[PDB]
């Protein structure tokens, strides 16, 4: 018996994976081309994607790159209340 359910979003950012290598980007150069890779979601390069930051410019040359696979990362907390009788 679920009584109350609330869903909350902690973070919302975009992470880019290479189709071939399967790694995540961690760093880029002056031209925004990749300098490094990392196989860790927590350390990967991130573009903020909360509502105020949509339609960015900093990573246009990155997004257009076909080898890269953008991924929308979302972190959530949900609260579930229960009643179990006597």
């Amino acid at each position: 018996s679920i009584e109350k359910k609330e869903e909350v979003i902690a973070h919302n950012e975009v992470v880019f994976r290479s189709l071939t290598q399967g790694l995540y980007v961690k760093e880029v150069d002056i031209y925004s081309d990749v300098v490094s890779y990392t196989k860790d979601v927590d350390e990967a390069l991130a573009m903020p994607n909360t509502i105020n930051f949509k339609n960015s410019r900093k990573y246009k040359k990155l997004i257009m790159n076909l080898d890269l696979e953008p991924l929308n990362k979302i972190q959530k907390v949900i609260y579930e209340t229960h009643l179990e009788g006597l």
Binding site: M47, N49, K54, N55, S56, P70, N72
Partner: protein
Amino acid sequence: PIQDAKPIDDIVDIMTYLKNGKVLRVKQDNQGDILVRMSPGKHKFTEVSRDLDKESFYYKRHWVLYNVSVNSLITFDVYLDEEYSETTKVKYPKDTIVEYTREDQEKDVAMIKEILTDNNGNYFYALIGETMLFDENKLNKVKD
């Protein structure tokens, strides 16, 4: 051949598509491409957006009012946005002025109207006022 472009000829069709609510894409000369739309809800009015890229989880189109003129619509090229292909990778686009030698080895100026290709990417051009095809090498771009 390639069907990257499907221009609309009649404005009546454009208005009909606008009544259907589908987004349009209108070209500009030496200026940024634009998208056009009819507003939903009780009040119907034209809206515009300078955002071209596709709607996404990281990208949302921004719409605002404008007093668009039919003169731009009737004159400029118009397309359905979703059906549009960003580019056709050829040396000389359509409506591009080139200099060519006619069949009798006399040189004339012309503009290009054709899209044909084999399965390897070799392209051919047919000139306005002409019938046969012309290669990428044969044509020469006419400087402004």
